Design a protein around this motif. Structure first.
Motif, mmCIF file in Angstrom:
data_model
loop_
_atom_site.group_PDB
_atom_site.id
_atom_site.type_symbol
_atom_site.label_atom_id
_atom_site.label_comp_id
_atom_site.label_asym_id
_atom_site.label_seq_id
_atom_site.Cartn_x
_atom_site.Cartn_y
_atom_site.Cartn_z
ATOM 1 N N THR A 24 8.342 0.308 -10.915
ATOM 2 C CA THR A 24 8.614 1.299 -11.965
ATOM 3 C C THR A 24 7.535 2.385 -12.003
ATOM 4 N N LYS A 25 7.969 3.655 -12.106
ATOM 5 C CA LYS A 25 7.107 4.848 -12.029
ATOM 6 C C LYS A 25 6.403 5.117 -13.370
ATOM 7 N N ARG A 26 5.060 5.064 -13.378
ATOM 8 C CA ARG A 26 4.304 5.080 -14.639
ATOM 9 C C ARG A 26 3.782 6.477 -14.976
ATOM 10 N N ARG A 27 2.874 7.009 -14.162
ATOM 11 C CA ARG A 27 2.367 8.363 -14.356
ATOM 12 C C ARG A 27 2.945 9.324 -13.321
ATOM 13 N N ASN A 28 4.206 9.084 -12.941
ATOM 14 C CA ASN A 28 5.069 10.077 -12.305
ATOM 15 C C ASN A 28 4.814 10.294 -10.817
ATOM 16 N N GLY A 29 5.779 9.914 -9.988
ATOM 17 C CA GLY A 29 5.907 10.523 -8.681
ATOM 18 C C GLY A 29 5.123 9.927 -7.536
ATOM 19 N N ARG A 30 4.982 8.597 -7.491
ATOM 20 C CA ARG A 30 4.627 7.928 -6.239
ATOM 21 C C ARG A 30 4.789 6.406 -6.317
ATOM 22 N N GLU A 31 4.539 5.814 -7.499
ATOM 23 C CA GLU A 31 5.021 4.487 -7.924
ATOM 24 C C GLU A 31 4.545 3.253 -7.117
ATOM 25 N N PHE A 34 15.529 10.319 3.115
ATOM 26 C CA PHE A 34 15.117 10.428 1.725
ATOM 27 C C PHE A 34 16.361 10.790 0.932
ATOM 28 N N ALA A 35 16.560 10.062 -0.181
ATOM 29 C CA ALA A 35 17.758 9.958 -1.019
ATOM 30 C C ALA A 35 18.321 8.559 -0.811
ATOM 31 N N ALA A 36 18.558 8.179 0.453
ATOM 32 C CA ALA A 36 18.961 6.808 0.760
ATOM 33 C C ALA A 36 17.949 5.806 0.217
ATOM 34 N N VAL A 37 16.685 5.920 0.633
ATOM 35 C CA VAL A 37 15.707 4.955 0.150
ATOM 36 C C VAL A 37 15.415 5.200 -1.321
ATOM 37 N N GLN A 38 15.564 6.446 -1.790
ATOM 38 C CA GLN A 38 15.434 6.630 -3.230
ATOM 39 C C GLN A 38 16.637 6.055 -3.982
ATOM 40 N N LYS A 39 17.622 5.486 -3.280
ATOM 41 C CA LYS A 39 18.549 4.577 -3.949
ATOM 42 C C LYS A 39 18.090 3.135 -3.879
ATOM 43 N N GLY A 51 0.754 -1.243 0.000
ATOM 44 C CA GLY A 51 0.000 0.000 0.000
ATOM 45 C C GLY A 51 0.785 1.294 0.000
ATOM 46 N N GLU A 52 1.897 1.367 0.715
ATOM 47 C CA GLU A 52 2.630 2.621 0.714
ATOM 48 C C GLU A 52 3.139 2.925 -0.688
ATOM 49 N N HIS A 53 3.030 4.193 -1.075
ATOM 50 C CA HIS A 53 3.680 4.740 -2.263
ATOM 51 C C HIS A 53 4.569 5.898 -1.874
ATOM 52 N N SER A 54 4.496 6.294 -0.614
ATOM 53 C CA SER A 54 5.307 7.366 -0.094
ATOM 54 C C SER A 54 6.745 6.922 0.055
ATOM 55 N N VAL A 55 7.641 7.809 -0.327
ATOM 56 C CA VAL A 55 9.031 7.631 0.045
ATOM 57 C C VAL A 55 9.259 8.116 1.472
ATOM 58 N N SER A 56 8.571 9.196 1.849
ATOM 59 C CA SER A 56 8.768 9.801 3.161
ATOM 60 C C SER A 56 8.305 8.873 4.273
ATOM 61 N N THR A 57 7.135 8.245 4.105
ATOM 62 C CA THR A 57 6.646 7.310 5.115
ATOM 63 C C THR A 57 7.631 6.163 5.327
ATOM 64 N N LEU A 58 8.165 5.593 4.240
ATOM 65 C CA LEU A 58 9.065 4.455 4.407
ATOM 66 C C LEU A 58 10.411 4.893 4.981
ATOM 67 N N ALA A 59 10.889 6.083 4.601
ATOM 68 C CA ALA A 59 12.094 6.615 5.231
ATOM 69 C C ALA A 59 11.886 6.832 6.733
ATOM 70 N N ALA A 60 10.715 7.351 7.116
ATOM 71 C CA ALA A 60 10.410 7.675 8.507
ATOM 72 C C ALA A 60 10.073 6.447 9.344
#
Length: 101
Positions: free
Chosen positions: A61-68, A44-49, A29-38
């Protein structure tokens, strides 16, 4: 294809404790990067690696941009690997075998 090596891109991607957690939770369910980092106390940057290598290994893979989001079709393994670990699982489990104490 059949000489492919993306099969291991998967199993190496899966071979960091947190790339998993990230996956298990985007699966869940999560699509947030911030929630998973927190929920792991990392930048953020670390998990975006981690996410990044889980993307380029074809797991995400990100389809219509920016939550994936997750990817396209060649894959399996997954394949095998499913039934691979279910053999491990099942036989593993069946040696439950206990007779009398």
């Amino acid at each position: 294809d059949a000489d492919e090596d993306k099969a291991d891109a998967m199993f190496h991607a899966l071979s960091d404790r947190t790339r998993r957690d990230i996956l298990r939770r985007v699966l869940a369910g999560e699509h947030s990067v911030s929630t998973l980092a927190a929920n792991y106390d990392m930048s953020f940057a670390a998990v975006q690696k981690h996410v990044a290598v889980l993307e380029k290994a074809g797991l995400l893979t990100k389809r219509r941009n920016g939550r994936e989001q997750l990817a396209s079709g060649d894959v399996e393994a997954v394949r095998s690997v499913g039934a691979m670990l279910s053999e491990l699982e099942q036989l593993w489990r069946g040696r439950i075998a206990r007779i009398d104490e």
